[PDB]
Design a binder for this molecule. Sequence first.
Ligand code: T7Y
Lengths: 235, 179
Amino acid sequence: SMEMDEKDFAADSWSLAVDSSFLQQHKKEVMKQQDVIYELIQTELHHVRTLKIMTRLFRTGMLEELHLEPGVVQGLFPCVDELSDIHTRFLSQLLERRRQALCPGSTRNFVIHRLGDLLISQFSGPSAEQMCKTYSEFCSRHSKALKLYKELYARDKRFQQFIRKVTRPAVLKRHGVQECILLVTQRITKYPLLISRILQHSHGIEEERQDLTTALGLVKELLSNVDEGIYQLEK
Amino acid sequence: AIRKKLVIVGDGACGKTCLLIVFSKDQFPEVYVPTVFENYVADIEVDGKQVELALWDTAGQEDYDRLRPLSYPDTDVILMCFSIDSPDSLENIPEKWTPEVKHFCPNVPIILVGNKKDLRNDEHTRRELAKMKQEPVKPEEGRDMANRIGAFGYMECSAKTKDGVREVFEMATRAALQA
Ligand SMILES: *CC(=O)Nc1cccc(N2CCCC2=O)c1
């Protein structure tokens, strides 16, 4: 993650991220709606950060510092490059929607009026197909990935030292190899929760209330298909 | 400091997300309560032992029978959450969550936690429940459930008032340490 985005999403909520004089110019329902939108983006930023830890710190680190077959590393971090590409492009669209929404003269004051369209494009058509096929694969290879890690940690002494070394920073306390895998699997089930609460405070503009309803149904369709395509593997 | 894993299971609005957020923040979120919980690694000192308790939630996984069990690998303590203002969420403890938790997590200690105990003295909660020929879960009913499902224990708490929250996670750590 980059410092610019880390600061924009450092605050605990949208009401605490904007200036208090900007917040005081808005209706309470607008503040409640913006808070859940800010959380969707804040958690997407964390999700992309989780995927970057898996790719650059764990995956790349093992390739560059360990004598492990790339097939072993493939088993440890399945579909991480594809998941990184899918979510980094989603974070891009969310971050530019926030930037467009900014008040001229400010870098923290914004109100997003349209979100649903972005969620429909993401959770429909080819993008949804690629995401459904990627999450089905990831979740079917998830158990095999946890097992393979445990075997490597309980047999290889240099792999054990690599893990101790890279996970030492405080920033990586909740971001070990196995935490990262579960954090990724649990991500898709967070979207209907976040979208339903956004939809619950977006009954002002009707074309927005309908967009969030189509996106909610589209995410649940995606989840039902990802769930149906799971079939656990073992080595 | 030994690493241990905690998972929380239970129906949709049993308050499991609220409980994890209130514990991981220490207080009730004053300005905004988050919709979701990602994970947390808590440093807990119970009975002279320094433990690293990893906190996980199954919220959002209730309708996905193939996705949900991926939360279970290497669990050391399970919190079987139910809402005290919802006697129906207690009826699903012995036939919905208990068989699943005993199949994927055999021998893992389970603590039956009765959430939202503040609602036992809520006039609006009792009025709505009366129109259903019901009343909030009595302490004896929760203990009778914990005993029936062979739970390690039964505890009550209130994520709103923070009452009982620290004692649940401390007891969970004690239970996870036993082998
Ligand atoms: C678009 C915008 O930023 N509106 C706004 C609300 C509250 C306070 C301000 N100010 C005053 C001068 C600097 C600034 O950002 C603006």
